[PDB]
Design an enzyme around this catalytic site. Sequence first.
Site, mmCIF file in Angstrom:
data_model
loop_
_atom_site.group_PDB
_atom_site.id
_atom_site.type_symbol
_atom_site.label_atom_id
_atom_site.label_comp_id
_atom_site.label_asym_id
_atom_site.label_seq_id
_atom_site.Cartn_x
_atom_site.Cartn_y
_atom_site.Cartn_z
ATOM 1 N N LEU A 104 -50.576 136.008 -7.518
ATOM 2 C CA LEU A 104 -50.554 137.454 -6.861
ATOM 3 C C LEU A 104 -50.867 138.372 -8.292
ATOM 4 O O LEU A 104 -50.647 139.348 -7.578
ATOM 5 C CB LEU A 104 -50.005 137.286 -5.704
ATOM 6 C CG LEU A 104 -50.245 136.685 -4.547
ATOM 7 C CD1 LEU A 104 -50.300 136.908 -2.836
ATOM 8 C CD2 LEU A 104 -52.185 135.779 -4.831
ATOM 9 N N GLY A 105 -49.162 138.103 -8.681
ATOM 10 C CA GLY A 105 -49.324 139.205 -9.845
ATOM 11 C C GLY A 105 -47.496 138.738 -10.423
ATOM 12 O O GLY A 105 -47.776 137.210 -10.787
ATOM 13 N N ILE A 151 -40.150 141.108 -10.655
ATOM 14 C CA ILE A 151 -39.070 140.939 -11.763
ATOM 15 C C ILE A 151 -38.390 140.039 -11.898
ATOM 16 O O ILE A 151 -38.895 139.219 -12.587
ATOM 17 C CB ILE A 151 -37.741 141.507 -11.144
ATOM 18 C CG1 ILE A 151 -38.007 143.028 -10.221
ATOM 19 C CG2 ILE A 151 -36.472 141.485 -11.161
ATOM 20 C CD1 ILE A 151 -36.986 143.918 -9.150
ATOM 21 N N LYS A 203 -42.848 134.203 -3.856
ATOM 22 C CA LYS A 203 -41.925 134.726 -4.620
ATOM 23 C C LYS A 203 -40.857 134.091 -4.559
ATOM 24 O O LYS A 203 -40.264 134.460 -3.178
ATOM 25 C CB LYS A 203 -40.956 136.631 -3.472
ATOM 26 C CG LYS A 203 -41.014 137.458 -4.277
ATOM 27 C CD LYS A 203 -40.589 138.607 -3.924
ATOM 28 C CE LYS A 203 -39.770 139.179 -4.577
ATOM 29 N NZ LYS A 203 -39.806 141.033 -3.659
ATOM 30 N N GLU A 224 -45.757 138.076 4.197
ATOM 31 C CA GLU A 224 -47.620 138.125 4.671
ATOM 32 C C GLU A 224 -47.919 138.427 3.547
ATOM 33 O O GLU A 224 -47.344 139.771 2.735
ATOM 34 C CB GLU A 224 -47.472 139.302 5.378
ATOM 35 C CG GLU A 224 -48.113 140.240 5.357
ATOM 36 C CD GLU A 224 -47.783 141.924 6.682
ATOM 37 O OE1 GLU A 224 -46.361 141.684 6.699
ATOM 38 O OE2 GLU A 224 -48.791 141.837 7.053
ATOM 39 N N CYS A 225 -49.392 137.959 3.331
ATOM 40 C CA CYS A 225 -50.074 138.880 1.824
ATOM 41 C C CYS A 225 -50.677 139.874 2.106
ATOM 42 O O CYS A 225 -50.795 140.795 3.207
ATOM 43 C CB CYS A 225 -51.361 138.060 2.333
ATOM 44 S SG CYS A 225 -52.228 136.860 0.733
ATOM 45 N N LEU A 226 -50.518 140.865 1.034
ATOM 46 C CA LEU A 226 -50.719 142.502 0.850
ATOM 47 C C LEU A 226 -51.886 142.401 -0.206
ATOM 48 O O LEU A 226 -52.013 142.344 -1.990
ATOM 49 C CB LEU A 226 -49.389 143.211 0.474
ATOM 50 C CG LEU A 226 -47.835 143.029 1.442
ATOM 51 C CD1 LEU A 226 -47.508 143.953 1.304
ATOM 52 C CD2 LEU A 226 -48.870 143.751 3.009
ATOM 53 N N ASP A 283 -35.441 152.599 -3.504
ATOM 54 C CA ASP A 283 -37.060 152.545 -4.347
ATOM 55 C C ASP A 283 -38.090 152.691 -3.961
ATOM 56 O O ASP A 283 -39.086 151.677 -4.131
ATOM 57 C CB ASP A 283 -36.634 150.754 -4.875
ATOM 58 C CG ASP A 283 -37.600 150.956 -5.535
ATOM 59 O OD1 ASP A 283 -37.515 151.481 -6.235
ATOM 60 O OD2 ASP A 283 -38.069 149.792 -6.214
#
EC number: 2.7.11.1
Lengths: 340, 332
Positions: B20-21, B24, B43, B89-91, B136
């Site tokens: 997904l990418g 950090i 994550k 939750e998928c974004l 942030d």
Amino acid sequence: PTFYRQELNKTIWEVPERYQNLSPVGSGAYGSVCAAFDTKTGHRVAVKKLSRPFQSIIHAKRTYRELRLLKHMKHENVIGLLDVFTPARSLEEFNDVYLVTHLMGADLNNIVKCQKLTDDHVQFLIYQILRGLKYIHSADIIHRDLKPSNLAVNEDCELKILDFGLAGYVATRWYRAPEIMLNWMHYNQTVDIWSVGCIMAELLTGRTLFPGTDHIDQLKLILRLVGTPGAELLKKISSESARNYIQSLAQMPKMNFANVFIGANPLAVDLLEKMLVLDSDKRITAAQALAHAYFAQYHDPDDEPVADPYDQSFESRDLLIDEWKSLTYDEVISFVPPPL
Amino acid sequence: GLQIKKNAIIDDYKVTSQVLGLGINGKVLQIFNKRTQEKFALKMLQDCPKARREVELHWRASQCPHIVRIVDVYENLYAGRKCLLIVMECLDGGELFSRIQDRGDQAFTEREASEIMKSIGEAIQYLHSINIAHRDVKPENLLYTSKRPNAILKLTDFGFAKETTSHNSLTTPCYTPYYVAPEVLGPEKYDKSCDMWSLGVIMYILLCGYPPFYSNHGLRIRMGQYEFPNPEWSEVSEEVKMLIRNLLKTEPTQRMTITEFMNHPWIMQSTKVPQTPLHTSRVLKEDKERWEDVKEEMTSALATMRVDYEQIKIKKIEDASNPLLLKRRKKA
């Protein structure tokens, strides 16, 4: 000469094996940074991965500039270079440049908001800023963007100067001298001395000196302290649009700073009066400041070295991107570690 | 409140290799629930007390509609390191500004901006009210729940969030001495006040497509000097401008608070809001890489506007020692 991929800061960090425990730090604004343990030396160090290094000629040149500086900057109070590396095996694979610097772990930006500093703190802090300043100006470099978040400080009180690449966008100019802000006059190295003044003001007070919004609001605050210009200095001004704004102003004389910063060590209010001055040609210099009284505890002529200025090896030799990406590349492999 | 599961996450989710990418501490991977075969995102953080607080707070936040929902939290070993795997939750949609970027353009109208801003202010209103500051709020943390029109805007990434004191503030007085007062240190004043500043800066980009930031090169205007350059700001109401300005007030205590914000008519009455189009979609198109610089500086600015509580304190000066300090003290 071997690396290892890791996922840090929305990037991909392949770095030499000597640096373990990469734990991200800082905003990740302009290059991201990771703290680390350096096995080969036993010390703890910082490792920043430059961002978008060769995206433009603006950026490409900007990176070669920045590298060239840091390789030549050797000094107790300017940020020294500990290594520089790159996972590419030859100019083709070249894409990323990583810096390794000694870890410090606080900057005045953040200290000023958590701690009430003493006069003795401020003496020694501003002393160090001036020491590296003198050295830097010598190399004939103008820092240009000196602020509290550019000054790394650790707990045993050492200070170091950071981040030169203006030597884009900026969110505030609370620390830039009015010369460079509205570009009337053109500028000394004393521009930097203007920032130092604001910083010292803020250390002594805990408040930011000129927290302005737009360039006028910022300018209206500067003048509220240092009084409007006299015909003397207005002569020395460039613009036409600039001169008129001044005259269009309730002309006010400089109120004495000892009346403003009530309860400051008088010797410091005095050094303030000589840094926060509107005329460039008449603003105190980095060298002259050290010899000022405030810094009696710390002034030592015999230990305030200068740099042997370096050149323009290219700099303005205008080149394509694939060009700089090679000059930079060379500067990278050309690197030799400082004294172990 | 939150219970962290101790089993292997593979027991429950098929942990796919597709990416997904990159974040950090984490490389985020797509995953599926075995039983229900819903799609989620995983994550990872390294499991320390910093990581468990982001975890906790973002748990509490998950009950809000406009904050990305945490579904489960596992503690497993991943390649021999303790880790909190976080399931989310998928974004789909992508960043907020990437969307407005791409258009018919069906035109981007000021009331859209108002809804989009009412969205974020709900997210932020939720947080502050239960006493959490995100600290942030920027473009890369406002993502959509799909590429469809029925997509919801969600606020992500609590790496910097922290709980703060709900503490009504000095309504700073009209008459004041020439001389500078003693600073009363109280860092907690930069917490909530940082999300309000964020709210301002985004709202500003939303209505013109460029930051309120200054430029390096000095005074084709693509940088408001905290001013509202025509034509883009020609049509935008002057009431909106007063808003941006109370939000960007330099002073943390003096600056607008989220409930004062949610009451403001341009948000509350999001719906009778002037419907004028905006140059946003077009300008954002303009120069791609210039956006990239907007994002870098927003991030650096946020970094000074907020307090790093994870920083060293300076010894009292006398308690300090170092090389220069020992050379000078010697000769003194």
